[model samples]
Target: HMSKGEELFTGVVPILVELDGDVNGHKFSVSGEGEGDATYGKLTLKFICTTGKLPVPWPTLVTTFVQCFARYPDHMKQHDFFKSAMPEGYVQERTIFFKDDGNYKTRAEVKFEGDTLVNRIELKGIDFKEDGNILGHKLEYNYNSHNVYIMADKQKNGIKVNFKIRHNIEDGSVQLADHYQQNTPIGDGPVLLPDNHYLSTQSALSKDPNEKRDHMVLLEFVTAAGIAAARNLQDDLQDFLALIPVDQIIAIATDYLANDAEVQAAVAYLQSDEFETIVVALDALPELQNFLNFLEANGLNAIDFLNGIHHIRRGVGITGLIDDVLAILPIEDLKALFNEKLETSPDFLALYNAIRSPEFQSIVQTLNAMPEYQNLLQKLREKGVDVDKIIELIRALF
Candidate 1:
């Protein structure tokens, strides 16, 4: 049922609000689209974030929220300000009631700085009341610091979500630095799991809708008001969590994992030789490691960087311009240009000669000889990258 205020906010079909922007270093885009009626109707919100330094290849933090709204806002501004005075970071304690029995409490605390975020942790006290015990987890993210900690807490009948990832600064490869799990009581807090499966599992977690859904409201508020302004609201905040129903949160969190094949596939991949080979190859590639390090240092990634280059090449007519130039120029003129550049351009000649040298040949041969390097190239080929063509193109450049 629409109240007077909600009716005033109602809209016809094709109602939409699109927002896309970058804050600090993180990039985020949001869209809310749905036709709202005089009574309850649906408003679907889609949010995607790119926290540049994270180890995940794609934008792992993607969330879709299906909310029931009485009306759509007339303008973006009016709707954006609904969370105008919201908090900067995650500072909420929620108790999730299980469908069958028992409930668990989760506490989240995430602090954001301009360039970096710290103390970004979520604590869960799971199955606490069931048997005077709780088996839970402490998930922490420190992407800026190049590390993520996922630890198991309380009774360890089956300790899950325990691993440490040191996103390697030198190579941009996510390294499993530590994996701790114990049946015996160690201390009061969380300990970290797994060696091979951790990456895939953590990758799985990164792609979790619930993981991102947990912070959706805070993210929306952070987007509207600046982070500093959002942080200001923390002091006066009371019963903010009550506004968003815990049942809805529970539904969102529980719904995904119930029959998630991504997680199952990831877990299965852990037992396969392909996954082990890829992990081994990832750590073995010297040149690729250097290349990835360069990319990460520049807040770039292979796929995105290639996509951008392709975009620029297409948009600016770089490829077409080159084709045009090659077509128009006489063969003699082209030969002369190349000869002059080779003879006179010391820098150009140096690069050309360096690649043409026996040393370069030996290096390439050495890489080809290595089983790890060959396996990596084979995997890239399987992924539809024409590895031989890529090599041929480099040869063509020479």
Candidate 2:
């Protein structure tokens, strides 16, 4: 498909030529081939940027190209004039494509200064029409400024391609801003739905993947909806109207689902009453200490007596137990042993009489001090009542 070169002196518009490939003494190779026509004349690429600087994805792509040719001069015979085109600080590093290859000899160029940047791209024997449409891309933008350009080109020929991207900082005009801001897709290539969910179709989403997916899905859905609306088709069969798509609902839920833990805590808090009624188990039953103390104190000296009995009875209970036992054997032994009648020692009746009877009230008065017979019951009491007659007589008087 080789063709003769025509008068296409598109005038070397200050851009790129022959880039990336490995060179070891004339044995040359590039990892892959771009769409080309060995029979073609020339393909033209003109990039016009009217911005503060080169925008995203482009800088990333463009710099690596320029950055490549800056290394390995012998790497390019295409640009013999490249010696003049090259700049300072020409350091080498990994190329943009392949990402794995290191500093292969290559170059491309673009320059920005004084608020405007214009550059041309010419691929000597390549055809821009081969893939059908030009490569589409996303661009950067500025506030209230239309960051766009005209993407004009033609499709027929052995090249002789003409395409121009021109930016405008034109008077009272925010025109170009719409395209860049909205990240309007270039080339019919795949409308790279930079999904922002919705940021008004005219504002570009920054390079956030999630935002891109969001914007992408939204544009897709809206477009689908627009088609549906325009067709005037009735979903009267009711299938379409009966339910919502699970993904959209999931997407919508994603909005609320992101804060799920907070929502869950708040919801649980609203219903919680269990915390309001914790039992401390307070007991109020009165302890009857006085009664208990009374019994404790009044208990007998039976402990000592019982102990004495234990010596004789060998641990036998001493009260009624001893009485019955001793009663059975004692009389005979007592009579035989006492045979002679015993006389009373001289009487002590005089002193005994003087000791006299208990002074009842005075002794009882001592009861107030307790300790002796604790409750010397010099105490008293009383009773109950009946009959409606007394109540009737009292009522009659009233």
Candidate 3:
């Protein structure tokens, strides 16, 4: 219905204006148009401010408005400024009508940043009235700090408008660092949920046998999924939690201590011409060690314990388990094992040479020269432990 002249009746009109501002040292101008008003019937005005830069240029700003409006018609069709300023992917639309009120009601919405629509903004009560003045008139604007360029909003001429602005940063180093540090589990490692599922689950050897096995597989899947999710959230632990089952954590932990052959087999299965199992194995190491330590404390045999730990280390491309074994074993037993293994393996000299640092050399020389250790080595060899296999394993690391 049309308005009556001097009737003193108040009605709220929804006007949308796309505006651009040039803020230079506390001064700014906003220029854009009102939909339903003739083209260029739009207005441009400047306001003095104490701080903050002006919005984008009028033409570019208007383009942002028009493009967003055309893409999001449900809310923008009724309001011009919103029609022009809202982003395509970041908007949600709805209508608002007050209870027991008849004068003002209008459609409203919000939009987010990105071509794919990643961020969001909301506007409600585009038209509201009270006591001959607009009431419940509200505006909200949002943009993508990570992906989009700009965002803005304002209330003017009894109408409210919002803008989703986009821009680029010249130096995003801080942001990038903050993104990774705040999001990832290892602080500075590649996303590895799907590629190495063990990371997403608990230890591979849990009280529940089924759970332990499942945890191992689940982690591999989680690592792969995590890698993909990182493109957006950037390797976040929380994101991994969202995709991984809490119960599987134990299984992941157990997989770390699987037999060396088993772990190596798994790694081989994951290996390809382009990528090797070493990467995934390494990713699984930290937790694997935790599992072996738990087993060792619980009275598992030292041989079995070392074997399991060694398997994990091998699969994960880590070579430090030998040092750990040496540290924990009786020095005499360790020397015997070392000599027996070295005697059967032709590569012992090379292995020893590689470890001939002053500290390592001193330990090797002292142990070899010890008569007790020499006698123990003879006993160990007679026990059929296949020292050659052990030495070959050590040599494989280099």
Candidate 3: segments with Cα more than 4 A from true spot:
1-354, 392-398
Q: What overall lDDT, based on C-alpha atoms, would model 1 receive against the true structure? A: 0.34
Question: Across residues 171-205, which tens digit of lDDT does each residue of candidate 1 receive?
Answer: 34342333232222122222122111211111111
What are the lDDT scores of the predictions, listed in order?
Answer: 0.34, 0.23, 0.28
The deviation in Å at residue 326 for candidate 1 is 17
Per-residue alpha-carbon lDDT of model 3 for 92-118, expressed as tens digits? Answer: 222322332221111223232222212
Index of the highest-lDDT prediction: 1
Error of 2 at 316 (Å): 80
Question: After TM-score superposition, what is the CA distance of residue 147 in candidate 3 from its true location, in Å?
Answer: 7.8
Cα-lDDT of candidate 2: 0.23
In model 2, the Cα lDDT at residue 362 comes to 31
Q: 161 in model 1: Cα distance from truth in Å?
A: 78
Better by lDDT, candidate 2 or 1: 1
2 or 3, which is superior by TM-score?
3
